[PDB]
Write a protein that binds this ligand. Structure first.
Ligand SMILES: C[N+](C)(C)CCOP(=O)([O-])OP(=O)(O)OC[C@H]1O[C@@H](n2ccc(N)nc2=O)[C@H](O)[C@@H]1O
Ligand SMILES: C[N+](C)(C)CCOP(=O)([O-])OP(=O)(O)OC[C@H]1O[C@@H](n2ccc(N)nc2=O)[C@H](O)[C@@H]1O
Lengths: 176, 177
């Protein structure tokens, strides 16, 4: 099956000879050549990595018939600054994502807002995340530019599980 | 890489016109034919499934060059009866193990002590778990017979992470009291 964790982006050599040329939704759905998988990026904190996360990564991996899934995971410094507390530290969250079935590669220290430099450096064809506007603010939606450029592929959240729900059962369990 | 969850054991067509014949450690380490991967079984609760669990599965999957890893996950009733409380219910625990990278198959309602019939029905060659005697009790080690029969392949625990440690950090961080 698989035997080794998904590598960090550092451990893979990319041909910078090939220029950054994206595939359209239409070519991506028809199935790209073996050598040229559609490169999908999904980003997250992935704190208390749970099945809600893995299902999202599963959907992003299946967006197209030949897909290579890159998962960016945000550092503690960024997450603390813009969102709040992490139970698991950055190294533990990098590690958990590496053992997910659907992942092909893990970028550490992922950015909060995606930049043209980052998308070009990782040769990203599409970005996958739920469709709810992510406002971390000074912005209404950090994904707005990605949706506007036609590169956004929405996934569905798994109802009935989340980091907050899990923490909440654990504190309820502890109180009673 | 992979696209679909690891299947549950009931979703897989299994040829029984094939006798239960175990491979020895020695044949296992040399590499079995492509069509006869070494079938390794690892069992657990997998509550708040974390990297220590995943690294145990990773080791079990790497024991031999051509390995098929079957992961047994115990039901809530057994766990509550013999070990203690679960944060995740059995369906959530089953599901999480299905998304682990190293798993080929998942057996639900896994037994507490392995029986000859279970080991035969799933055609298990080796059982992987850490080497600390697991006493649930009326036994000193529920893996005792597996060890004596030569089918036990010990994995190493990942230091510094556990279901308990995680619960403990969460209580410090968010509990009102
Ligand atoms: C901070 N960003 C904007 C750079 C990345 C996104 O940050 P986030 O807060 O959505 O991260 P997260 O770790 O909460 O979720 C990562 C991904 O898993 C998904 N997810 C999470 C919980 C859940 N029950 N179902 C899900 O499908 C989210 O929709 C998201 O697509
Ligand atoms: C109940 N049994 C005997 C049928 C199954 C064993 O039950 P358990 O309590 O060892 O289950 P568990 O979910 O705690 O552990 C599952 C597997 O993960 C391993 N594990 C757990 C935590 C950790 N930090 N490192 C690990 O390597 C355990 O050694 C075991 O091999």
């Amino acid at each position: 099956g698989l035997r080794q964790p998904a590598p960090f982006s550092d451990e893979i050599e990319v041909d910078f000879s090939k220029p950054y040329v994206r595939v359209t939704m239409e070519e991506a759905c028809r199935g790209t050549p073996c050598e040229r998988p559609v490169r999908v990026y999904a980003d997250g904190i992935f704190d208390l990595f749970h099945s809600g996360h893995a299902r999202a990564l599963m959907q992003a991996k299946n967006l197209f018939p030949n897909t290579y899934l890159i998962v960016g995971v945000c550092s503690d410094e960024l997450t603390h600054n813009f969102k709040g507390f992490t139970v698991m530290n950055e190294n533990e969250r990098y590690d958990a994502v590496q053992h997910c079935r659907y992942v092909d590669e893990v970028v550490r220290n992922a950015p909060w807002t995606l930049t043209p430099e980052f998308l070009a450096e990782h040769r990203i064809d599409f970005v996958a995340h739920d469709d709810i506007p992510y406002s971390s603010a000074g912005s209404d939606d950090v994904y707005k530019h990605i949706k506007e450029a036609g590169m956004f592929a929405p996934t569905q959240r798994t109802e009935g599980i989340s980091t907050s729900d899990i923490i909440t059962r654990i504190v309820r369990d502890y109180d009673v």
